[PDB]
Amino acid sequence: QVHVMQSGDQVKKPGASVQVSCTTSGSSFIEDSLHWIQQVPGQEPEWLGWVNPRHGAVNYSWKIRDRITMTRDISKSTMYVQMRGLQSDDTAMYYCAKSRRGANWALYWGWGTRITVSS
Amino acid sequence: DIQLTQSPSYLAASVGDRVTITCRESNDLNWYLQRPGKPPKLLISGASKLERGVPSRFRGSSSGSLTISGLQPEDIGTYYCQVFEFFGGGTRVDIK
Ligand SMILES: *[C@@H]1O[C@H](CO)[C@@H](O[C@@H]2O[C@H](CO)[C@@H](O[C@@H]3O[C@H](CO)[C@@H](O)[C@H](O[C@H]4O[C@H](CO)[C@@H](O)[C@H](O)[C@@H]4O[C@H]4O[C@H](CO)[C@@H](O)[C@H](O)[C@@H]4O)[C@@H]3O)[C@H](O)[C@H]2NC(C)=O)[C@H](O)[C@H]1NC(C)=O
Ligand SMILES: *[C@@H]1O[C@H](CO)[C@@H](O)[C@H](O)[C@H]1NC(C)=O
């Protein structure tokens, strides 16, 4: 019955740093690679990054480098995602995905983080 | 890079009719169900090893394709054929 949870939806002006939090309950946290992905609704999700809580090693994507920061706290088994220099064309939806066995892909999806900006 | 050859994303199946979704490329074949508003749920991982709580009708054609023997209300929604961290093309289903 392992599940994941995340914070609600936030609306703020573009150009401001955004921060979100995720947590996982019911499973071991050290050896499970977490993922953070975003999608424009009715389109193809683009993977943003992944983190390995066992040693904190992170990996990002091609269009998100220098604008992403991933932190993990296996102690409280919670993960923080903070993005700086937010642009206009990022009003999309975000999931904090969790993958079993620390392998690729992901199975458990979050509660639908909605990060939006207005012009 | 790699671009998956996907069949057109439109079907008219309603209830109890074997249809398939083409994702012809290498490998595997990770398929997910996208939910409207609700969080998405993965359907099959590895195209051959079903998990717990998923219907036995869901079958992946190895290095293909999610061949489903029929359509039921609990399996409606967009079907995504993801890969190692790239994606597919997607295929949304509906009942007519
Ligand atoms: C004779 O047999 C019957 C049936 O086989 C026995 O009755 C069953 O007893 C078990 C254990 O007492 C019970 O299972 C629990 O059910 C609870 C309610 O569904 C669950 O909450 C509980 O899970 C917690 O405990 C587990 C450890 O046992 C943990 O692994 C699990 O993660 C849960 O722990 C979380 O929650 C607790 C409390 O909230 C917290 O302290 C933890 O830190 C953690 O956060 C068990 O699954 C069955 O439900 C009983 N079955 C029935 C039908 O009642 C009966 O006990 C046997 N007779 C004797 C004498 O033993
Ligand atoms: C222990 O203290 C350090 C330094 O304050 C802190 O970073 C770490 O999270 C703490 N460990 C625990 C048990 O959370």
Author numbering:
A (entry chain H): 1 to 52, 52A, 53 to 82, 82A, 82B, 82C, 83 to 100, 100A, ...
B (entry chain L): 1 to 27, 32 to 68, 72 to 91, 96 to 107
Structure paper excerpt:
Humoral immune response to HIV-1 targets the envelope (Env) protein of the virion, a trimeric membrane glycoprotein complex comprising gp120 and gp413. BNAbs target distinct sites of vulnerability at the surface of the envelope: the CD4-binding site (CD4bs), variable loop V1/V2 apex and V3 loop, a larger site spanning the interface between gp41 and gp120 (interface) including the fusion peptide, and the membrane-proximal external region (MPER). Additional studies allowed the cloning and sequencing of B cell receptors (BCRs) and permitted the identification of broadly neutralizing antibodies (bNAbs), which can neutralize most viral strains at low concentrations in vitro. Three potential bNAbs were constantly identified as CD4 binders (bNAb2101, bNAb4251, and bNAb1586) belonging to the VRC01-class and derived from the VH1–2*02 variable heavy chain gene segment.
